[PDB]
Design a protein around this ligand. Sequence first.
Ligand SMILES: Cc1cc2nc3c(=O)[nH]c(=O)nc-3n(C[C@H](O)[C@H](O)[C@H](O)COP(=O)(O)O)c2cc1C
Ligand code: SF4
Lengths: 56, 428
Amino acid sequence: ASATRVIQKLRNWASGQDLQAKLQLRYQEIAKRTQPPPKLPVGPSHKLSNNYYCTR
Amino acid sequence: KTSFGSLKDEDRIFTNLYGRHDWRLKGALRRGDWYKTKEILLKGPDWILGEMKTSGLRGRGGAGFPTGLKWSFMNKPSDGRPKYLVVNADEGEPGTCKDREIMRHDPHKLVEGCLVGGRAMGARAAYIYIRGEFYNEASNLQVAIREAYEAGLIGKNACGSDYDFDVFVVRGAGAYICGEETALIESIEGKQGKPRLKPPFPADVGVFGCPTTVANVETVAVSPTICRRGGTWFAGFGRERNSGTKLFNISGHVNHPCTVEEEMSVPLKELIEKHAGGVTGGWDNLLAVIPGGSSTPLIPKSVCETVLMDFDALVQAQTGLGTAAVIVMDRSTDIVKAIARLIEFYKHESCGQCTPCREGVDWMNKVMARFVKGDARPAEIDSLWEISKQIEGHTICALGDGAAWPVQGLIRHFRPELEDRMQRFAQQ
Ligand SMILES: Cc1cc2nc3c(=O)[nH]c(=O)nc-3n(C[C@H](O)[C@H](O)[C@H](O)COP(=O)(O)O)c2cc1C
Ligand code: SF4
């Protein structure tokens, strides 16, 4: 992120293509590390009725 | 042979169902009992069962099965054991008062009919099991039996007849389950009122391991005058498959609740309107009726105007007749509360030996209370239907059926009220 705009130019020329947009490192574009709690869903066979294990 | 429910007093086979003339012998003898009983007995046993089979007399207890066939299951001789006759009077199902009202006010009909049933079958004696709460009624009955023994109608020479008989009065201790054929038998034997599996049948091995056929009060009380007046006359009234007179107990939300003897296959509306005058607020104020006591589902008023009080009709209406104890609701009462109360009853009165009625009745009790309060959601209604269907034919005795049927009657005819109570509780 810090490449003083002329070394950025040097590396983008020697490489062949802009890499300041596609960087090997991670600064702030990542999913953060403490998150909200989820509510995971519940699959079928939780029907509460018309659901007998002999049928499925 | 069409639209016949009303009749006169020559046919009233319970001439003193209101205690208005006399219950003792002197006063009952006038009303046509103990008249030709020697001739009846010495006519023959098979003649009696023929009169029964021609009368088309179905069991006037809960489960209506044709007598004659039932009583003929121990016409065979005895292979080294005595035979017995258990008269059932544990009138514990809600709404049912008829057996009380005959127990008092006409015991001698019962006594002579029980004798007649024994000699039609074979029986050393009889055991009249009667509810423990019916103390005074049982004492009236014991007094009647004592008068009979004194007058010489029972004992070493039962009205002569070359046939000896006794009549005992066993006294229960307050449990609805002891009305079943087999819980009754075990209670007489001196144990808990826990039914047996059926097989074995009481006619091969019953009370004290001896043959028996259990019978209800009126089922036998109408036997002697049937023999005295023929199966043609008893079968002339009522439809061809379910015939005869019928005691009708009426309760709840009607101006004049009463017990009535009436013609079988009478419409429910004719019955309610003639006797026990119109329901509170009239027919339009009717909401639902239970024709049996409590082991029969509901009726929604859509098939109250076009239904006959019969076994076959109510079976066609996805319902059933039991002891015919009509109960009425009149739009001014929470119905789910009533059925929840019935299931609370069926929980209290369970014996508990077989798992479905032990647990699932308590399930349904809790869930129906939760439905009363509205603390459930409609995905549980069909779950509870499934619970009912699990309980139905998975039991030793038909108390699980009786617990499950009102549930189905409410789910079939009153589901939107459950929906409304649920959405009300959810909103609030
Ligand atoms: C839980 C339960 C309770 C019953 N209670 C009675 C009762 O109190 N009185 C009665 O006559 N039958 C009762 N029955 C039905 C009896 O099996 C029936 O009366 C008996 O078999 C005689 O049938 P009958 O009408 O042919 O004489 C009950 C059945 C069950 C399953
Ligand atoms: S259904 Fe209930 S009362 Fe009948 S045998 Fe089972 S547990 Fe006992």
